[PDB]
């Protein structure tokens, strides 16, 4: 009967973690930052509208130059926009129209897409002679691709619906490392600013902090009551925010290893589809199912504005690395650049 | 501005190819194929002729897209909204697995999956074309086995007509949206024809209701 003994030991071990986390909860983020003055009402005007998608937009990603962005939609096309002049630099037809994620390489030579086909496809934008062509189709995942992020021009980290994340090598196409430990489908991931670590929120209402080099989980964060749909690292790299299906957001601290603040309102009952931070980290922008994007003050957990310009569910959110714009895609097949 | 004006007409050239492909996609009928794995979906796809399998077939100058997502083995809720907008849903149920078990008999598993997809929030008006395959093996099996194995509340003769009609009505009873969507039931043989015709008929009804939405009559 060793199974019962192991299960009983885990319960005591789990209680030890909760006791230690409760000891370090000296105060609350709300109490500490009660003195700081609020940011006030924030009004953002739609500076640009990008049209050309004929189906729901499921993902977007800004370029590192804060001028180009790539958007994915279920009409089977990956479109690269010039966010200053609305112009379309590229239009990439995908083999499978069921695309649910998009990525833009930090160098800018590659983009990636994936979805229900269980394959992440790398597209070469440099194209020394001709047009955009596929470079490497990374197969090996069992479930649908939910997220993908470029570490560099040769390494990409992906999360799938088979409860596992992976680390790939574009040159060889093989999984360098496989991250296991989730019990539900992994819905999103966010690379750290130092690229060494990343987090992943899955449907089991848990967020796990992984190590890219070693390949094993370090810290586990709980507190959500539903599937985590989006994750995003704080600009400092020592915190992150989660967006779940219970219409609430949570800010976890890596060093404190526990929840810090929550962003909930009795008005909103619609879950969050995408979260994003501002450049300074003071604002936490979250996209909701009730057709409006929200701006939260991450230090005071107070509403600061509404980006209401979409007709359907907001699916993707992004903030430029420069920090002077916010692009918001949604299921009405339109992207809007705010402020 | 010479290079800036030349990039503008590149966007306009990209614009018109987006619309040309958008028109071509809008003329295609999208169908979602579901089942219990061994429910005969492999038989059905041949009748109309990892990840997601797309099947292309045509009938009476109409182009159909049929997506099979039976190899996903993931949480259905997270990716089921991608198919919100298909013309119809083709459901395959094997009539011969009313007594086989996966525990729980396989027939109740299909009724559990059918109930979830029929009452889904994303599918409130999409028509469901229910195919009950393996009617030949089901006909022979009831001669030596009773339907009471599956449903303990059944009270009727062990004949094909009485038992088969009893299975169909239990599948239509799981529909709670009885007034906004319709369920088309067809008893399919392993080697039979006119299966694509029944799909075409139930798809045309969706088009007529779709057309009457634009004109405001319906």
């Amino acid at each position, epitope marked *: 009967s060793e199974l019962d003994q192991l299960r009983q030991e885990a319960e005591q071990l789990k209680n030890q973690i909760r006791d230690a986390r409760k000891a370090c909860a000296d105060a609350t983020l709300s109490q500490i930052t009660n003195n700081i003055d609020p940011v006030g009402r924030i009004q953002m005007r739609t500076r640009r509208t990008l049209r050309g998608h004929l189906a729901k937009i499921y993902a977007m990603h800004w370029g590192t130059d804060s001028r*180009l962005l790539v958007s994915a939609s279920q009409d089977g096309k990956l479109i690269i926009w010039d966010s200053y002049t609305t112009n379309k*630099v590229h239009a990439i037809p995908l083999r499978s129209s069921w695309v649910m994620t998009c990525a833009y390489a930090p160098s800018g030579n590659y983009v990636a897409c994936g979805g229900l086909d269980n394959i992440c496809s790398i597209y070469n934008l440099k194209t020394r*002679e001709g047009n955009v062509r596929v470079s490497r189709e990374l197969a090996g995942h069992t479930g649908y691709l939910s997220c993908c992020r470029f570490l560099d021009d040769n390494q990409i980290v992906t999360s799938s619906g088979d409860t596992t994340c992976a680390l790939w090598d574009i040159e060889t196409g093989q999984q360098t490392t496989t991250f296991t430990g989730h019990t539900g489908d992994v819905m999103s991931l966010s690379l750290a600013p130092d690229t060494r670590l990343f987090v992943s929120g899955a449907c089991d209402a848990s967020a796990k902090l992984w190590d890219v080099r070693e390949g094993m989980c370090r810290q586990t964060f709980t507190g959500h009551e539903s599937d985590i749909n989006a994750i995003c690292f704080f600009p400092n790299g020592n915190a992150f925010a989660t967006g779940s299906d219970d219409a609430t957001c949570r800010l976890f601290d890596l060093r404190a290893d526990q929840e810090l603040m929550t962003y909930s309102h009795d008005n909103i009952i619609c879950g969050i589809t995408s979260v994003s931070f501002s450049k300074s980290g003071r604002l936490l922008l979250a996209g909701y199912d009730d057709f409006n994007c929200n701006v939260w003050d991450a230090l005071k957990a107070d509403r600061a504005g509404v980006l209401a310009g979409h007709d359907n569910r907001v699916s993707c959110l992004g903030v430029t690395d420069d920090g002077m714009a916010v692009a918001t895609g949604s299921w009405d097949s339109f992207l809007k650049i705010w402020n | 501005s010479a*290079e*800036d004006k*030349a990039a503008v007409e590149r966007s306009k050239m990209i614009d018109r190819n987006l619309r040309e492909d958008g028109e071509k996609a809008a003329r295609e009928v999208k169908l979602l194929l579901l089942g219990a794995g061994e429910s005969g979906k492999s038989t059905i796809v041949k009748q109309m002729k990892t990840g997601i399998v797309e099947t292309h077939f045509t009938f009476k100058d109409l182009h159909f897209k049929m997506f099979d997502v039976g190899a996903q083995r993931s949480e259905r809720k997270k990716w089921i909204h991608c198919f919100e907008g298909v013309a119809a849903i083709i459901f395959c149920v094997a009539l011969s697995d009313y007594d086989l078990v996966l525990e729980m008999n396989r027939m109740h598993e299909s009724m559990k999956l059918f109930d979830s997809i029929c009452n889904n929030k994303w599918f409130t008006d999409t028509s469901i074309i229910l195919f009950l395959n393996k009617k030949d093996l089901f006909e022979e099996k009831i001669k030596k086995s009773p339907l009471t194995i599956c449903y303990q509340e059944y009270a009727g003769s062990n004949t094909y007509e009485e038992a088969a009609a009893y299975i169909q009505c239990q599948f239509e009873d799981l529909n709670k949206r009885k007034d906004t969507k319709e369920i088309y039931t067809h008893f399919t043989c392993s080697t039979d024809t006119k299966n694509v015709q029944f799909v075409f008929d139930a798809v045309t009804d969706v088009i007529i209701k779709n057309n009457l939405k634009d004109c405001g009559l319906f």
Partner: single-chain antibody, 226 residues
Framework: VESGGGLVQPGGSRKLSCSASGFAFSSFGMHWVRQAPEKGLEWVAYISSGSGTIYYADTVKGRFTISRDDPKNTLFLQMTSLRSEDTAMYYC??????????????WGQGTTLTVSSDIVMTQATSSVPVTPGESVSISCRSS???????????LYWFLQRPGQSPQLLIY???NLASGVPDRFSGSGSGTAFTLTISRLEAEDVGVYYC?????????FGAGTKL
């Protein structure tokens, strides 16, 4: 690659052809830059992708006609009234225009035929010492400033090695073309521009041309041979 052309004729008419090969010809705008037997390069005509905007030089505005055939990957140039001023080597140049594109990247081999306001680019210097291992700088000046409102100066640097077609070194003020070693640098002040070579190799000798791209009657700079 791309090649094809015509031959000698007495004061008549001829049609030039170019055969594209394996670079998605349908999405590239093509020029017809020409070079006289011992003068510098001179632009002739232009046809955009999809046969949209078409431009001609002021000296060939009515006589010449440029057309393209996206199927079969062939570009045409119809020359009707051929004078004694237009005997030259006609090069075919591909160019694509998007946000980060590099126009004039690839040049055709070019063929010879004999018959028997605008912005002027000065490039006053015409000859420099040929010693290797030094750091030579090639200067250029423009009639009007090439710094447009969007913030990038449309000045292109080309290098024609003696015996072959010109090759693009630097597109716009400082952006370096693909395959060009980092020895070449570009600095400009909107009107005056310089091209810097750190260390001279045996293959760096030749004539260097400078071209503007602000307004479409675009002109070259007569070259600065090494």
């Amino acid at each position: 690659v791309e090649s094809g052309g015509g031959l000698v004729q007495p004061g008549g008419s001829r049609k030039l052809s170019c055969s594209a090969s394996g670079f998605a010809f349908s999405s590239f705008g093509m020029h017809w830059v020409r070079q006289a037997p011992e003068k510098g390069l001179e632009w002739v005509a232009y046809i955009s992708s999809g046969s949209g905007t078409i431009y001609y030089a002021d000296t060939v505005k009515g006589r010449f006609t440029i057309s393209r055939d996206d199927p079969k990957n062939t570009l045409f140039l119809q020359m009707t009234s051929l004078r004694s001023e237009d005997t030259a080597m006609y090069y075919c140049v591909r160019s694509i225009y998007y946000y980060g594109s590099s126009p004039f990247d690839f040049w055709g081999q070019g063929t010879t035929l004999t018959v028997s306001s605008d912005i002027v680019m000065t490039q006053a210097t015409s000859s420099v010492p040929v010693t290797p291992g030094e750091s030579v700088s090639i200067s250029c000046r423009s009639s009007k400033s090439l710094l447009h409102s969007n913030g990038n100066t449309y000045l292109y640097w080309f290098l024609q090695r003696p015996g072959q077609s010109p090759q693009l070194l630097i597109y716009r003020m400082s952006n370096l073309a693909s395959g060009v070693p980092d020895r070449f640098s570009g600095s400009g002040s909107g009107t005056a521009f310089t091209l810097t070579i750190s260390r001279l190799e045996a293959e760096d000798v030749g004539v260097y041309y400078c071209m503007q791209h602000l307004e479409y009657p675009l002109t070259f700079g007569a070259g600065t041979k090494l």
